[model samples]
Target: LKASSLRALKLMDLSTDEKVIALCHQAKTPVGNTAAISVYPRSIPIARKTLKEQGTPEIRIATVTNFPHGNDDIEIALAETRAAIAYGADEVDVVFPYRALMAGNEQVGFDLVKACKEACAAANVLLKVIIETGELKDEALIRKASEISIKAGADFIKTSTGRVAVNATPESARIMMEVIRDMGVEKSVGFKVTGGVSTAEDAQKYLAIADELFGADWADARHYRFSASGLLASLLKALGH
Candidate 1:
């Protein structure tokens, strides 16, 4: 379970040795299925190569764009997403410009989502857009953001950046799932509830929500994900480790 998560910490002062230690811990953890490693954009190459040399198959390489704050220029965000893919990133988690949507500049946010998706499609990579539901703080905004992201081509509608005060709440996840359930878009959409999910019980709670909203059979990693550093270990312990 931990292995399937995109465990990340923006340790700005991490030395090469410390970064290597963290990477080793992540690479050694047992995953329910597969997992991803997300590091600073600059560290992606070394992180990816090191994981590959360690015989870590089914482990994907991911990085962030427009990062914790999605206030960057669209061109800059697009370039960052493209560069991450070029640097061997199998998944690109870009922060949607939710601030723009909140400020009533919906076109800017929608266009940026489209632009990022264009790059992801061209590169045959997965695109996960962080909607930052914590900042939105309103069900109406969350639903609108979900709709726009899906319409523009987001493979996954993620809950938060894990940097916010109020990250992924079950209420927020429910609303996002509702949008996906009725999207009528044919393409399979996934949900990732990140931020505060750090217990086996919490993981089960979120999983049940997805299962209830989607179907009992759709609760696997393909249709749902939970990002955490502590939650995976706890989940393993609960499963009788």
Candidate 2:
């Protein structure tokens, strides 16, 4: 379980260049290496450089755009996506404009995601759309946002930005997974849990949920990810390292 947990981890660092360097180093472990190292857009070059210097560029580099708030204009998010890819980001996590969706404007969210998806696709980078489930505050809205994100070409539907009062909850994750399952995109779209997931036990809970919903062996890093800041330490400690 510990080894499988490590493989599903997407270690995140939204701090300084030094912290990103440390994160890059921590990406590899005795059990197994993390799936990716995530940082801010500005830190993508340092993350890429550090990973390459460390001889483990195989670890994917991810950055966020229109982050936390999820209210940026579509053009801004697109530019950010293009720029992050230019800076060597292998993956881009763009926050979907959930507030607009709440305002009865699903097209706003869809356009933002579609634009970013085009940019990411052109650059051959993966695109993950964060729906900010905590702020969505309703199961139907969460489900709608998830559906729109998947329809708009998101490679993954992320739960939060880790800057919200409420982030990835089991209920929200289940709803998102139901959408993926019902849409029959289980083999294509992925799910990511971020924010408030800090302990090895918490990670295990999510892994178990995925196992029950998806399958026992269906959720490798390709299909599921736990993107968190403190999760790595807890997982390492659980492995008795």
Residue-by-residue lDDT tens digits, candidate 1, 69-185: 998389999999989888877778889899999988878888898999999989888888899999999999999999999998898888988888889999999999999988964
The alpha-carbon deviation from the true structure for residue 69 of candidate 2, after best TM-score superposition, in angstroms, is 1.3
Report RMSD (Å) for each prediction in the order shown.
4.6, 1.9
TM-score of each: 0.87, 0.94
Clashing pairs in 1: 1-32
State residue 16's C-alpha deviation in candidate 1, in Å.
3.9
Runs in model 2 lying further than 4 Å from the true structure: 1-4, 7-15
Angstrom error of the Cα, residue 181, model 2: value is: 0.3
Off by over 4 Å in 1: 1-21, 30-34, 185-187
lDDT of 2 by residue, 1-241 (tens): 5654464454332227778888888886766667788888888888888889988878888889998789849988888888899988888999999999999999999999999999899888999999999999899999999999999999999999989888998889889989999999999898898866688888878877788988888777668888776787787787778
lDDT of 2 at 5: 49
